[PDB]
Write a protein that binds this ligand. Structure first.
Ligand SMILES: [Cl-]
Ligand SMILES: [Cl-]
Ligand SMILES: [Cl-]
Ligand SMILES: [Cl-]
Ligand SMILES: [Cl-]
Ligand SMILES: [K+]
Ligand SMILES: [K+]
Ligand SMILES: [K+]
Ligand SMILES: [K+]
Lengths: 238, 230, 248, 243, 244, 196, 233, 238
């Protein structure tokens, strides 16, 4: 077996291999998640599909369990492993314990997996950050996010990838009860925050919504463009 | 007590070229010349066996080796590395026969032997083989000639040459070789291609040659080589 | 010991993997390989890099591999690494069949090999497979499909794509000509010859220099055929005759 | 562009731009680091071994200083190079010889023992974790079917059968000596083959040595048992040369 | 004499002139250590070692460089003492394995042969370093007679009538050449061993020293043991008074 | 000793299982469910060893669910049944084998209604109708008698009625309540439990 | 390039010394051992008002009578915390008792230099933990506070501070400590020193506070309770 | 330097630098003194504090009823060797029912400490110990180092400024053999005193003493239990 320490401490006290993996996520596609009152909504961008490519395969929103879904940024090859490892853990938690997985537990597992890859011999850390979205069994909405180091935090709204620094700052200015009042305005809050950084056009936006008790819904390029119509109606006017 | 290296000694350069394989290709390109010709009713394989001294026993070691009843081998490059590939190919031929009770198709042997060559371009603590193999065979009433190289890649040939002056040997064969030869005619043009890169006078001890047909594979006796050298 | 370690599975300051991107350069020097999806089928068209007067031609194909009853792939890069991956693809396809007793869905087979290739970029300290693959097939879920595989272990589904020599020039050529939803196999075969002719090096184009295989659904059975030399000859000459009717 | 280097090709057993193995090539120079020369000659009825026996001081037990080794009742060998490397190869040879008889029930042929060690020496040439053995083994013995045999194996992994062979520091000059003696077809008797081996080492080094200064091991058709000649029997062959 | 940078870091790497420097640097460690001596007499073998007193706080008998490998076998070491003790343990286990397999006391030549193989094994790989010491092995029986062997870091073993290892191995060997050990009784030999140690010892570079002495012959019934305080002090007085 | 039964129609699959959880001589439960939801249209009914049944059934259940998450679509009734067969057959010549007798019922969008029978030895067979338990010996003849491949759902429940009444009259064990569910185009529907 | 188990000419392990430097980037944490209890305080370091307040957990519960404050790389810490929680319950199962604060700290200190490359397991540690820990609790030896760093060295402390501003908070504790301090003054002091060494102002949602006293168990302070201790600024 | 990164690399002079670098770790630790009479073996060590608020570090550790140690160097390497010593003493009492002779235990340290100095990737133990024990041969004072080499000694001192203590013991080494236990400890304390600077002397907080002999089992005195030894002191002279 390959027994070489890949991730080591630097003279200044830095983990370079972890920091380079954080450079990989900053090169990744823009992904934003925002918790509402009744629903939670993810939104991913920087799609730039050649229109000669079937976009059904390259979807960055994945469902881990019936009540848990996630979006990622960075090395898309690395993501597939973490996603499938989380999906296996979803059913393992269902086998060892009767109860379905809580949003915090899945986030904790993904974080512990990423942490293990920073302190284990022979392997480099994952080049991805994740945005975990789901509902508790009691019904309280939850949003979490991870990073290559193995740390996780709960968020009201957060963005990862390229232009994350720009989108995050937008959410700080635009996160009030006036934008979360309805289920529609929360979805509009995603699109507006998304279309703020991307090469403009609704054709490049894929976003998913899930209600308190309803199954995960991946929206039609028709439904999202109807909301893009409502943002440009109130752009030259407002 | 020891424990091997677990890291590849063959890696991609910025140019996108696996340098150690091309460096292994230089080892065969500098080795003694070898030639193989597929000739309608059989296959011939010939090599330069010049030991460069009269002290050597020309009968002791062989370069043209049998793998099974119907398959033979010749090489250009390093002798020690070639030996390993012979022993591995002989085992692979028997592994096939034990399972299927049928003489191994030449194409299937080369695929299995080339896969062993592939391992040493990716496995840890090892260098690739510095040998290019020439595999002949007879199965389904058809002659076969194959080339395996350090890369792990394999090619099917009507006629080819390798080692010293492999570029001049191939161009010679492009003009000299014609399809639908007789086996005995193929030995002549095999020795002729070998004469193009020899340097010295040819005796039956200076060269080694094996033939493959419907009766199987065998190495030509020193008496048989002398008769073709006229 | 660590003095000789090349550190293959390590991160670059910019946040990328060197050995992966260096392997990408190996694909660029390999043969041009394209795949086009149509309404009544899907095909692979590849440049033969093994060309000589003295080559024997024993096998049905050089770069096109049959993996499954309903699937086939083409290759660009190091052929020995390609042989290892294609053999593994045939194994995974059979393991699925043994377990579920029905053919493996197209996307799942690509996913399985990509996980192996990704593993070589993360752990083991070994060089990645310098191969890009194009998969064509039919399953009962999404019908006719086309996939592209990277040495990074990353994949994507395409309607038309290319990998190998002059790959960026070939894809932009396809982007203009490809008619989404209107493409028939006869139109896609004509487009394949058109793209190859402009892309390839020797200029005139020959039946020995190109390799084309078609995947069609006939009588409830998936039929895969590597086109004969007499068929290819007609495909090249039909484009040759339209090259003569382009001036007045 | 002869003798070019790139990477760690001078340190580990990997290829150079030319396709050479320098570590293997340095192992041949390690044979000369012993400071001794070994010569083997084959006759019609016998196979003879000869090597210089250098004893620096009388404090050393002269009986323990040897490069002549017994591997089998029929098969012997002479070692040239690093003394510790040489003894390791002898112990492995004895292991392989006895292991052959346990598996196959008959005495190991001289050529098959030589090939087996050559195959193991090849492993050090392909794997980078270990260095090759800086030593040289020349095997003698009589095959029941093919007569007398003289075989030599390399740190490179090369093995071959010979009519006559030298090894060590004065190898290149003694091979040219043997070539001249081969061209002239003598009657290769026991005395002829022993003296050809003795006179070869006595000319290239130019000593005219005492019986204590050399070692001789022989294998004959009538007596296939590998035997070291000792002082008294070598003294008989040395006074036979001065006649 | 030495090659820098590349060809001397690993034992799995040959130098351009066909040398393994890691072994040679391990051979330098024993050359720096104080002198160990041992010679073969008519009826046994005697060992002698100068033991440099680093501090007067250490006990008289500490850092023993004379070992009991087997009841009939004795070991005299010179070099890195840490490696010397591990090799003493390896030699002890080998002599124990022989009796467990064959049922009698191990022949000294074979014991020397077996341990030398273990020493040699550490000179081939990058994963391990060669042993930084050299050691001697001595035994006596009625059948095999008196025997004396010495093993160095490379894995080489030879028989000896007289042998020395350490700082002044050359100054010792020239003094041994003077003795008619083939005819001398081991009781007389101890006296001569003690004086050569005293002559070899550098009193103006090294501070002070203790003398270690060992038996293995007919007087000890074939058992390897320590030379008693009575006989040692007689040999020490002999060493000091014949130093003039 | 438990009881399972399945009846396949032209466009539906009717399945029933007893609701008794028995220990030695006592009925611990009156309302125990022996049906397992694998997909939206797949049901697995398991019978056999006390601890082995639930552990095995849930393991397959969670793996069919894992397939749904990893691919976005569910396994076909055939692929599901062949998966359960593979897992049981591989444990047959091991140190710990599972003594479970199961019945898989499903609806495919292409092939249609499906019903699979499986041994504890792991032999798979597709049947128009099947039954597990000792009650099968008393009911398979009634099924043979009145079954037609074109049976309506109204008649299927009435045929099940005839089989369950036989278990009350002739069968020595007390099985008063049964779970009844139908699988079709729309999925799994919980039907009125048959009590006596 | 060197290995992970390489000594400096000074006589120290490089990877350990560099792990100490990783702490100097982490947020400041303060523990105070009072004769009537132990208090732990830490800054959360909020990067964005979008981030949930109670999401960051730099003070955690290990047992009913033991609390732990962490600083440095948080990801590495929670691996050590889980091992500490496992140890307490393994000991409870075997001996039917609560572990001492010293034994818990010692158990974590056993994982210290258990890292390496060769001659190790496939899942063995490649590097040390970039974490400094403050174990504060009450056992049968009264209230206790312990400090631990990547070197494995653990020692009892009357009052200790670790983080980015370690020296600044250490000197402030040095002149404002009596071994007869009350628990009221203990929390006060930790709050007073915390605002001085921080870049951000002290808010009720900005910091975590915990108390372990002989009477009641380990207690996580609620926002309303923090406002009663911040009223006395 | 390039001959100083691995234990498996010999210096051209005939040395291993990594063993010598590990020896530097012992000298950086606080001083400890060990001495013996004909009946008793006494260990006296200097406790050290990083700050005045932090308590003093443990220097003396238990091994068995008849054997005790004092540490100098790395803490984790000290605890690792301490646990090995304890295990070997436990195995001896489990099998033979008699206490393990001190001479043999130190030989097991010498065998174990040697292993990592010869293997690649491994490192020497960064701790030096002073072992005080009592068996059939009476009292023993032993010294171990990062180099597997060990010493049987009448008295010894290791750590920072241990030379001053070493010289004191060397003058009074003939005194110890007929010494009373109370007089023996004072000799150990007076040696340890020499290590400290002129401004400061031995206090009840920074002195740890361990005693084993014919009379009693190994016992560690720390705070209030130490003051009887310090009281009755000949004043610090120069
Ligand atoms: Cl490695
Ligand atoms: Cl198939
Ligand atoms: Cl040679
Ligand atoms: Cl700290
Ligand atoms: Cl210390
Ligand atoms: K559940
Ligand atoms: K005797
Ligand atoms: K340290
Ligand atoms: K130096």
């Amino acid at each position: 077996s390959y027994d070489r320490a890949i991730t080591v401490f630097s003279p200044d006290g830095h983990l370079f291999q972890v920091e380079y993996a954080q450079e990989a996520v900053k090169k990744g596609s823009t992904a934003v998640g925002v918790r509402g009152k009744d629903i939670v909504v993810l939104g991913v961008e920087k799609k730039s599909v050649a229109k000669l490519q079937d976009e059904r395969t390259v979807r960055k929103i994945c469902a881990l369990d019936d009540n848990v879904c996630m979006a990622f940024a960075g090395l898309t090859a690395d993501a597939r492993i973490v996603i499938n490892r989380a999906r296996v853990e979803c059913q393992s938690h269902r086998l060892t314990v009767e109860d379905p997985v809580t949003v915090e537990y899945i986030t904790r597992y993904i974080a512990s997996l990423k942490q293990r890859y920073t302190q284990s011999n022979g392997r480099r850390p994952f080049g991805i950050s994740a945005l975990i979205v789901g509902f508790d069994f009691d019904g309280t909405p939850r949003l979490y996010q991870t990073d290559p180091s193995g740390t996780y935090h709960a968020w009201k709204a957060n963005a990862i990838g390229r232009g994350a620094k720009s989108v995050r700052e937008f959410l700080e200015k635009n996160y009030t009860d006036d934008a979360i009042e309805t289920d529609d305005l929360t979805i509009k809050l995603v699109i507006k925050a998304l279309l703020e950084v991307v090469q403009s056009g609704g054709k490049n936006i894929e976003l998913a919504v899930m209600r308190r008790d309803q199954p995960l819904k991946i929206l039609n390029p028709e439904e999202i463009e109807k909301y893009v119509a409502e943002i440009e109606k109130e752009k030259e006017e407002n | 007590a020891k424990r091997g290296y677990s890291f590849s000694l063959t890696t991609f350069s910025p140019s996108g070229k696996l340098v150690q394989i091309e460096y292994a290709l230089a080892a065969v390109a500098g080795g003694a010349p070898s030639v193989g010709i597929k000739a309608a009713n059989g296959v011939v394989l010939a090599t330069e066996k010049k030991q460069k001294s009269i002290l050597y026993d020309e009968r002791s070691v062989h370069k043209v080796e049998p793998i099974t009843k119907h398959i033979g081998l010749v090489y250009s490059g390093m002798g020690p590395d070639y030996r390993v590939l012979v022993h591995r190919a002989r085992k692979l031929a028997q592994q096939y026969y034990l399972v299927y009770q049928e003489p191994i198709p030449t194409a299937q042997l080369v695929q299995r032997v080339a896969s062993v060559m592939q391992e040493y371009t990716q496995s840890g603590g090892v260098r690739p083989f510095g040998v290019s193999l020439l595999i002949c065979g007879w199965n389904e009433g058809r002659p076969y000639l194959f080339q395996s190289d350090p890369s792990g890649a394999y090619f099917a040939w009507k006629a080819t040459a390798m080692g010293k002056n492999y570029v001049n040997g191939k161009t010679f064969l492009e003009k000299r070789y014609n399809e639908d030869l007789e086996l005995e005619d193929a030995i002549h043009t095999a020795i002729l291609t070998l004469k193009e890169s020899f340097e010295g006078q040819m005796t039956e001890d200076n060269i080694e040659v094996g033939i493959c047909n419907e009766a199987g594979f065998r190495r030509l006796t020193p008496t048989e080589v002398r008769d073709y050298l006229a | 010991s660590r003095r000789y370690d090349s550190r293959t599975t390590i991160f670059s300051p910019e946040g990328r993997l060197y050995q992966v991107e260096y392997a990408m350069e190996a694909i660029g020097h390999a043969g041009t390989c394209l795949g086009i999806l149509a309404n009544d089928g899907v095909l692979l068209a590849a440049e033969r890099r093994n060309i000589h007067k003295l080559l024997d031609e024993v096998f049905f194909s050089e770069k096109i591999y049959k993996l499954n009853e309903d699937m086939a792939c083409s290759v660009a890069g190091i052929t020995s690494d390609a042989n290892v991956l294609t053999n593994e693809l045939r194994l995974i396809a059979q393991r699925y069949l043994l377990q579920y007793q029905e053919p493996i869905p197209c996307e799942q087979l690509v996913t399985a090999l990509c996980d192996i290739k990704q593993a070589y970029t993360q752990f083991g300290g070994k060089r990645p497979f310098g191969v890009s693959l194009l998969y064509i097939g039919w399953d009962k879920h999404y019908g006719f499909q086309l996939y592209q595989s990277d040495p990074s272990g990353n994949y994507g589904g395409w309607k038309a794509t290319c990998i190998g020599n002059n790959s960026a020039a070939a894809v932009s050529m396809l982007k203009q000509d490809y008619k989404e939803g209107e493409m028939t196999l006869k139109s896609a075969l004509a487009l394949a010859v058109k793209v190859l002719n402009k892309t390839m090096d020797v200029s005139k184009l020959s039946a020995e220099k190109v390799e084309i295989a078609t995947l069609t659904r006939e009588s409830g059975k998936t039929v895969i055929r590597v086109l004969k030399q007499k068929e290819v000859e007609q495909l090249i000459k039909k484009h040759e005759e339209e090259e003569a009717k382009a001036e007045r | 562009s002869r003798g070019s280097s790139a990477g760690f090709d001078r340190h580990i057993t990997i290829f150079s731009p030319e396709g050479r193995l320098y570590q293997v090539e340095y192992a041949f120079k390690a044979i000369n680091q012993g400071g001794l020369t070994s010569v083997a000659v084959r006759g019609k009825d016998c196979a003879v071994i000869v090597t210089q026996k250098k004893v620096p001081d009388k404090l050393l037990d002269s009986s323990t200083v040897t490069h002549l080794f017994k591997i089998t009742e029929s098969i012997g060998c002479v070692m040239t190079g690093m003394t510790a490397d040489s003894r390791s190869q002898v112990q492995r040879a004895r292991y392989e010889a006895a292991n052959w008889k346990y598996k196959y029930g008959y005495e190991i042929p001289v050529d098959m023992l030589c090939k087996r060690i050559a195959d193991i020496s090849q492993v050090y040439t392909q794997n980078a974790e270990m260095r090759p053995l800086g030593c040289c083994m020349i095997l003698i013995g009589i095959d029941e079917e093919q007569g007398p045999q003289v075989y030599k194996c390399d740190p490179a992994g090369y093995y071959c059968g010979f009519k006559a062979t030298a090894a060590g520091v004065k190898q290149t000059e003694s091979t040219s000596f043997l070539e001249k003696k081969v061209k002239k077809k003598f009657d290769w008797t026991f005395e002829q083959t022993v003296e050809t081996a003795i006179t070869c080492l006595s000319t290239v080094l130019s000593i005219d040595f005492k019986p204590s200064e050399i070692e001789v091991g022989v294998v004959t058709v009538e007596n296939p048992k590998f035997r070291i000649l000792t002082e008294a029997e070598i003294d008989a062959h040395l006074v036979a040369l001065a006649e | 004499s030495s090659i820098g940078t590349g060809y001397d870091l690993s034992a799995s790497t040959f130098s351009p002139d066909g040398r393994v420097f890691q072994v040679e640097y391990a051979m330098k460690a024993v050359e720096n250590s104080s002198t160990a001596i041992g010679i073969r007499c008519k009826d046994g073998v005697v060992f002698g070692v100068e033991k440099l007193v680093l501090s007067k706080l250490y006990e008289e008998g500490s850092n023993k460089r004379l070992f009991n490998v087997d009841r009939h076998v004795g070991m005299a070491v010179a070099g890195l003492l840490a490696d010397a003790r591990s090799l003493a343990d390896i030699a002890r286990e080998e002599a124990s394995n022989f009796r467990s397999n064959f049922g009698y006391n191990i022949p000294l030549k074979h014991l020397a042969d077996r341990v030398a193989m273990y020493v040699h094994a550490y000179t081939l790989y990058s994963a391990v370093r060669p042993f930084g010491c050299s050691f001697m092995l001595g035994s006596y029986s009625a059948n095999d007679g008196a025997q004396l062997y010495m093993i160095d870091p490379s894995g080489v073993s030879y028989g000896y009538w007289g042998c020395a290892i350490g700082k002044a191995r050359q100054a010792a060997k020239t003094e041994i050449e003077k003795l008619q050990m083939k005819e001398m009784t081991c009781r007389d030999v101890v006296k001569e061993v003690a004086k050569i140690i005293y002559i070899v010892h550098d009193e103006v570079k090294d501070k002070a020293f203790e003398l270690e002495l060992s038996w293995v012959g007919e007087l000890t019934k074939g058992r390897h043991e320590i030379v008693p305080k009575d006989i040692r002090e007689e040999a020490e007085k002999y060493a000091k008074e014949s130093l003039k | 000793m438990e009881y399972l039964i399945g009846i396949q129609g032209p466009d539906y699959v009717l399945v029933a299982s007893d609701r008794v959880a028995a220990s030695n001589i006592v009925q611990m439960k009156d309302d125990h469910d022996k049906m397992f939801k694998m997909s939206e249209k797949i049901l697995l009914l398991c019978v056999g060893e006390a601890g082995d049944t639930v552990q095995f059934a849930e393991y397959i259940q969670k793996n069919v669910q894992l397939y749904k998450m990893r691919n976005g679509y569910e396994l076909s009734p055939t692929a599901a049944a062949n998966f359960t067969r593979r897992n049981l057959a591989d444990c047959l010549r091991s140190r710990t084998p599972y003594h479970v007798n199961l019945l898989l019922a499903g609806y495919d969008e292409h092939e249609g209604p499906a019903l699979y029978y499986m041994d504890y030895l792991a032999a798979l067979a597709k049947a128009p109708f099947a039954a597990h338990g000792y009650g099968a010996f008393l009911t398979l003849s009634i099924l043979d008698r009145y079954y037609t491949p074109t049976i309506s759902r109204e008649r299927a429940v009435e045929l099940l009625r005839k089989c369950l009444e036989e278990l009350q009259k002739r069968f020595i064990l007390n099985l008063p309540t049964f779970s009844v569910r139908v699988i079709d185009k729309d999925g799994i529907h919980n039907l009125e439990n048959i009590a006596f | 390039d060197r290995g992970v188990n390489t000594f400096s000419p000074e006589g120290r392990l490089f990877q350990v010394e560099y792990a100490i430097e990783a702490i100097k980037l982490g947020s400041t944490a303060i523990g105070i051992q009072t004769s009537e209890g132990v208090c732990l305080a830490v800054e959360k370091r909020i990067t964005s008002p979008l981030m949930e307040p109670s999401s960051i957990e730099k003070i955690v519960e290990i047992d009913a009578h033991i609390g732990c404050a962490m600083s440095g790389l948080i990801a590495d810490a929670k691996t050590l915390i889980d091992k500490a929680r496992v140890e307490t319950q393994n000991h409870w199962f075997t001996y039917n008792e609560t572990m001492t604060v010293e034994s818990v700290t010692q158990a974590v200190s056993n994982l210290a230099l258990q890292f390496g490359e060769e001659d190790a397991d496939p899942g063995a540690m490649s590097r040390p933990f970039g974490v400094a820990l403050l174990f504060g609790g009450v056992d049968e030896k009264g209230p206790q506070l312990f400090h631990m760093d990547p070197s494995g060295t653990f020692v009892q402390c009357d009052a200790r501070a670790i983080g980015s501003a370690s020296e600044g908070a250490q000197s402030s504790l040095q002149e404002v400590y009596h071994k007869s301090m009350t628990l009221k003054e203990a929390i006060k002091s930790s709050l007073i020193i915390l605002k001085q060494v921080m870049e951000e102002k002290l808010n009720a949602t900005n910091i975590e506070l915990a108390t372990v006293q002989p009477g009641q168990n380990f207690h996580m302070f609620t926002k309303e309770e923090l406002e009663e201790v911040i009223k006395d600024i | 330097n390039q001959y100083d990164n691995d234990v498996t690399v010999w210096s051209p002079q005939g040395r291993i630098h990594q063993i010598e670098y590990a020896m530097e770790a012992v000298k950086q630790g606080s001083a400890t003194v060990g001495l013996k009479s004909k009946t008793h073996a006494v260990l006296v060590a200097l406790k050290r504090a990083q700050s005045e608020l932090a308590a003093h570090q443990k220097k003396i550790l238990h091994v068995d009823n008849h054997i005790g140690i004092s540490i100098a160097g790395l803490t984790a390497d000290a605890r690792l060797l301490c646990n090995f010593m304890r295990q070997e003493c436990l195995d001896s009492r489990f099998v033979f029912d008699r206490p393990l002779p001190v001479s043999r235990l130190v030989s097991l340290i010498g065998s174990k400490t040697q292993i990592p100095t010869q293997r690649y990737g491994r490192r020497p133990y960064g701790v030096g110990l002073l072992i005080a024990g009592y068996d059939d041969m009476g009292p023993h004072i032993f010294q171990t180092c990062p180099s597997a080499n060990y010493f049987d000694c009448r008295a010894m001192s290791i750590g920072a400024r241990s030379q001053s203590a070493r010289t004191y013991l060397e003058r009074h080494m003939s005194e110890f053999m007929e010494c009373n236990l109370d007089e023996l400890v004072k000799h150990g304390l007076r040696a340890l005193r020499e290590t400290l600077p002129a401004e400061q002397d031995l206090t009840t907080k920074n002195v740890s003493i361990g005693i084993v002999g014919k009379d009693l089992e190994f016992t560690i005195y720390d705070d209030d239990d130490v003051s009887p030894f310090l009281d009755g002191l000949e004043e610090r002279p120069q």
